[PDB]
Amino acid sequence: LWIVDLNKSDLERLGTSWSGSITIGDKLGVSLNQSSISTLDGSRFIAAVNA
Amino acid sequence: LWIVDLNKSDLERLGTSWSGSITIGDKLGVSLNQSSISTLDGSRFIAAVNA
Amino acid sequence: ATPWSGYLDDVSAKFDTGVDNLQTQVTEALDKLAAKPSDPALLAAYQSKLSEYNLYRNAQSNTVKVFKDIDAAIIQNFR
Amino acid sequence: ATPWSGYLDDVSAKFDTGVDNLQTQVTEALDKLAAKPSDPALLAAYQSKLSEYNLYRNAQSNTVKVFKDIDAAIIQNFR
Amino acid sequence: ATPWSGYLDDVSAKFDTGVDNLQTQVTEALDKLAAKPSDPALLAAYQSKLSEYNLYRNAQSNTVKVFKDIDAAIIQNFR
Amino acid sequence: ATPWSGYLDDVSAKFDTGVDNLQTQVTEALDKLAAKPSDPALLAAYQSKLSEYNLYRNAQSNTVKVFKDIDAAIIQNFR
Amino acid sequence: ATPWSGYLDDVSAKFDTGVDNLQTQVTEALDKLAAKPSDPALLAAYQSKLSEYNLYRNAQSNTVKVFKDIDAAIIQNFR
Amino acid sequence: TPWSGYLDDVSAKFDTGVDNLQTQVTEALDKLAAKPSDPALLAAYQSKLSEYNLYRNAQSNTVKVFKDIDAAIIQNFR
Amino acid sequence: TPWSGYLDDVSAKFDTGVDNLQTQVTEALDKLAAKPSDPALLAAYQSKLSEYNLYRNAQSNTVKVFKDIDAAIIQNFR
Amino acid sequence: TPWSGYLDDVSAKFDTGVDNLQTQVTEALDKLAAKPSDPALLAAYQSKLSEYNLYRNAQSNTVKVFKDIDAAIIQNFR
Amino acid sequence: TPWSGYLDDVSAKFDTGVDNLQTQVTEALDKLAAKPSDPALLAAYQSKLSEYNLYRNAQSNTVKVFKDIDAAIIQNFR
Amino acid sequence: TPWSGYLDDVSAKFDTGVDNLQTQVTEALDKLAAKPSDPALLAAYQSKLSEYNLYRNAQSNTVKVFKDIDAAIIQNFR
User: What domain of life does the native source organism fall in (chains C, D, E, F, G)?
Assistant: First the structure.
């Protein structure tokens, strides 16, 4: 009895993700793509990279 | 009653993997091939080698 | 991802953000005093700053420890 | 056809419909406490919900067996 | 209508409605004091507030546990 | 889908994914502190972190025990 | 109109009409204690009342079960 | 299998219903035995061992229930 | 009689997981007792004694939980 | 031959983090013992001995906390 | 000759470890009290006293730890 | 001799194992009561009393386990 298995696969992943938090004075702030504002001065951003 | 078993095997692993992180200007974190937060606030790279 | 933080480290951070610059002032004063150790203007200043920093850290650590004990006492009762 | 349901099913379901939303309240309060394990308010809430849930499931499962033991006792006499 | 609440829920909530505003007063005083850690009038206030909050949360959790045990002991006897 | 998991595994993983990275934060802040054991900022950090890790693992192990108790109580009533 | 009461009902009623007033004393105690949790005069009383309540409920249940099993054993011999 | 009764079919449903827990618990034991003081390994093993316990209990009670139903029916042939 | 049941095996895994601790704990004790007032010996002993404590506790609880799994099956043989 | 757990690992991290203090404190004492009235050597030994006091204090408490967190899990196995 | 347990053995290890310190302390206190104001005698006595204190303290804490490991094992014979 | 059962034999193995503890523990008390503030006396009594505690608990637990084995066998003669 002859039993034969053959298998091939390819995958690729590439690109970037972005989110951040910006604060203007005490009274104002904005959260981009994130549940909450970072209690933080100025601005911060993150650029996750996959390749 | 004669019983006979024979085996051969050949194996080879060789190469490298990479990941890391930078920070710029207290604006931007960047992370490559990490699921981490890039927590250090300073540039790190980590190679991995096997042969 | 944002650096994850709990309750206790946020109560801790409240003090660090309450004292706006004391952390740096304490070093600046030491720097100039070390430059001229016998100057009595500098001495009374550094005395003030250091006496401030000491109470700052003490009150911080104690508050954290009490808020830990209140949580451990509740988590024990889950059984 | 509509799903068949007996008398034990009926008795069991009375509890599920008696506790309107507990069955989901205990899931939400978990996702919260898990998001911030060190807040006493969240702890004090979850302790209550988890207790109520435990008591509900015990009273249910005991009552169903008590009924099953009556039916099985009567059916024995048909002989 | 309102989220379903049992007996234990209605017991726990009694404390919360007993200490009308303590939950806020504690954070208020905490912020005022963090503003100026070296002020005795603030320290003498926050000591009292935090002591009250500790006693309250503790006695709450113990009472809820005792009322869980009283029920479980009864439910066990149904079978 | 994951290698296998029961309902208890899930309840555990909810904490392990609720504290996003505390495990590595604590693992590294120690490697900072040990290299300069006498810096008060480093100390106050490590204190605040290790208290969180303590409470986390504590409540994690208690929840599993309570769900195991609830299941045993029902399986026992089949027979 | 008025409830039919069996024998076990009479047994339970002996306890209910034994502790004339405890059922409400416990609630009043709780209400005032929850109003001002930090008073040791309130606490010292509530501890006693709650303990008496626990014992009362426990004895009542255990007693009922014993009578149930005596009756069941007699009935079995009719067959 | 050479032969499998209805009760065997019931038991096998549980076995094939849990993919790999049989070995998972075995491996977790050896890992923990290597470092009995790591919290992560402890928190893992507590879960696996609880799951295993419930699996065996549920498995064994069902077989008994089904045995009693059959015994009751068989009795009435007389 | 090299006879060893499943519980014996489960226990032996710990014994063979902590290869040398069994004696390290006594070596440290003897050298500490030779000079009790030395910080290096105190700090070493603490770290060994605690590990030995947690070792014996995990060892005995595992055994008990397995016994309680077996007994619940054997009860159903009737 | 050697065996090391999580708790002694946690100690080792301190031992390796103070690269040389273990020796510096021993030497500064000898120097001071040679001429106790030199204020230079006095200020040096004061610095070192305080650093050693803190290193030991923090080490022991860290170990103790990690023992307690394990005991509280092993208690729930049963 | 008289029966001795494991906790006895662990206790006696210290008594034999600090070979003579009990005697040295009993002597140093007598020769000090004979002239309370010699600073060489005070400086000698301080060490012996501190050594005795640390000795007895380590001795008792060790015993209590080994007691509670055994009470923890015995609790599971049930 | 009076009649003695298998549980009596098991019980007595302990008593005859610890030949003299039964009285050592009393003499230690009689001495310590004479001068309650002698650390040499206290260090001895702590040990003897800990040994006594462990002895009595192991004894009772063993007896109970054999009682429950016998009861479980006797149940099935019917």
Answer: Bacteria
Q: Which residues of I touch K62 (CB under 8 A)?
A: 29, 49
Domain boundaries, chain L: 1-78
Identify the residue among I22, I37, I42, I54 best suited for mutation to test binding to J, counting J beta carbons within 10 A and taking the highest: I54
CA distance C67 to F59: 16
Query: Do residues A37 and A30 lie in contact, with contact meaning Cβ atoms separated by under 8 Å?
Result: yes
Q: How far apart are CA J70 and CA K68, in angstroms?
A: 16
CA distance B15 to E8: 62
Chain G residues with CB-CB distance to E59 below 8 A: 33, 37, 43
The beta-carbon contacts of L42-46 under 8 Å, at least 24 apart in sequence, are L43/K11, L43/K56, L43/K59, L43/K60, L44/K11, L46/K60, L46/K63
Instruction: Please report the resolution in angstroms.
Output: 3.3
Q: Which two tokens stand for residue J23?
A: 């020796």
L17 exposure class (CB count in 10 Å sphere: 0-12, 13-18, 19+)? exposed
Listed in order, strand segments (DSSP E) in H11-68 are none
Please tell me which residue of chain F has the smallest CA distance to J17. F35
Rg of the Cα trace of chain F? Answer: 18
H-helix or E-strand spanning residue B29: strand B28-32
Following DSSP, what letter does each residue of L16-29 receive, concatenated?
Answer: HHSTTHHHHHHHHH
Using beta carbons and an 8 Å cutoff, which residues of I are at the interface with J?
18-21, 24, 39, 43, 46-48, 50-51, 53-54, 57-58, 61-62, 64-65
| Pairing mode, strands A43-50 and A28-32 | unpaired
Q: Is B15 helix (H, G, I), strand (E, B) or coil?
A: strand
Structure tokens at A44: 């911060």
Measured N-to-C along each axis, helices D7-18 and D40-75 cross at an angle, to the nearest 10 degrees, of 160
- Strand A43-50 to strand B15-24: parallel, antiparallel, or no bridges (unpaired)? unpaired
Q: Which amino acid is at E12?
A: S
